[PDB]
Amino acid sequence: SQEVMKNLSLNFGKALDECKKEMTLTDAINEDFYNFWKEGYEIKNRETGCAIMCLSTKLNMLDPEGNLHHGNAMEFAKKHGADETMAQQLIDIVHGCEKSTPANDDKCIWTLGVATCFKAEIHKLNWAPSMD
Ligand SMILES: COc1nccnc1CC(C)C
Numbered sequence: 001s002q003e004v005m006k007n008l009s010l011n012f013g014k015a016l017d018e019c020k021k022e023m024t025l026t027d028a029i030n031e032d033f034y035n036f037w038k039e040g041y042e043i044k045n046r047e048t049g050c051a052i053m054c055l056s057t058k059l060n061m062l063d064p065e066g067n068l069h070h071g072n073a074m075e076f077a078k079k080h081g082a083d084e085t086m087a088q089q090l091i092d093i094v095h096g097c098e099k100s101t102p103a104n105d106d107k108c109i110w111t112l113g114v115a116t117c118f119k120a121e122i123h124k125l126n127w128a129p130s131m132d
């Protein structure tokens with residue numbers, strides 16, 4: 001549900017400010033986060049992939065190679081209002097996109113691709129939120 005996905009994204013984003021400092025990241029990234037769930041919007045900045053990976057890691061959802069920890073990702077979904085069935089769905093999508101996205105040494109870019117694949121799957125389900 002959109003409503004859930006809205007709360008997830010707001011909460012995934014909360015620690016952005018800490019990552020900064022910790023990464024040297026710019027304001028191109030805030031424009032990418034602000035626009036993320038916009039239909040057809042396309043993330044072009046490498047450094048936004050870096051920021052997602054830093055956020056996910058800080059939430060214990062990511063191993064040091066960029067892959068999803070499925071258990072921890074379920075725990076994060078459930079903490080923010082996803083029931084079981086929605087959470088496991090979110091998980092099957094990230095995992096599916098992990099498998100489909102070309103492998104890449106550049107974790108930041110690979111993370112872009114996964115996050116793009118994910119966003120597209122979520123619009124398809126009619127779950128992408130309107131983030132004011
Ligand atoms: C795990 O990452 C997430 N999980 C659920 C919802 N939103 C995101 C992130 C965004 C949009 C930055």
Ligand SMILES: COc1nccnc1CC(C)C
Pocket residue numbers: 052056061066067068073094111114115116118119
């Ligand atoms: C956990 O969220 C994530 N984990 C790894 C890479 N990308 C994201 C964003 C998604 C899944 C949209």
